[PDB]
Design a protein around this ligand. Structure first.
Ligand SMILES: NC(=O)[C@H]1CCCN(C(=O)Cc2cccc3c2SCC3)C1
Ligand SMILES: [Zn+2]
Length: 139
């Protein structure tokens, strides 16, 4: 579990969105596993606008933060699950690091701010749905 609170928006993994997220839906994309909903309260997370390939992510299955190098956002094949059929997930970044079901939602950050959130993982790997291209989150 985990979300990004920026301005009047809440960004979460689409497969983990609630009834409230869908009733106040701003934008959603199954291929990216992202859903953004509107909020009444103001959010204060800063989103990074960079091309960093190093950062720190929160791993709830270990209750620890870990430094990682990560790949550039790209189309990556993702195995069938109870949420999606077998498909390519776009804007995904991979890193070597621990990750198990339940770590989705954990924030990945660089010196500039929030880069994205855990969405995939397995075999000593962790996939992060990137949010740096969503320039509208700020305005
Ligand atoms: N984006 C998707 O289609 C997700 C949907 C849920 C399932 N999924 C996974 O990768 C499961 C998983 C296994 C092992 C470690 C981890 C995970 S998810 C957090 C870390 C794909
Ligand atoms: Zn950065």
């Amino acid at each position: 579990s985990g979300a990004i609170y920026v301005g009047n928006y809440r960004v979460v993994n689409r497969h983990l969105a609630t009834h409230n997220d869908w009733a106040n839906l701003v934008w959603e994309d199954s291929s990216r596993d992202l859903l953004v909903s509107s909020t009444t309260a103001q959010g204060c997370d800063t989103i990074a606008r960079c091309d960093c390939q190093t950062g720190v992510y929160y791993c709830s299955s270990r209750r620890k933060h870990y430094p990682v190098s990560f790949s550039k956002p790209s189309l990556i094949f993702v195995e069938a699950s109870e949420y999606y059929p077998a498909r390519y997930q776009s804007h995904l970044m991979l890193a070597v690091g621990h990750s198990e079901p339940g770590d989705c939602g954990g924030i990945l950050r660089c010196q500039h701010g929030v880069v994205g959130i855990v969405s995939t993982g397995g075999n000593g790997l962790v996939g992060f749905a990137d949010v740096r291209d969503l320039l509208w989150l700020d305005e």
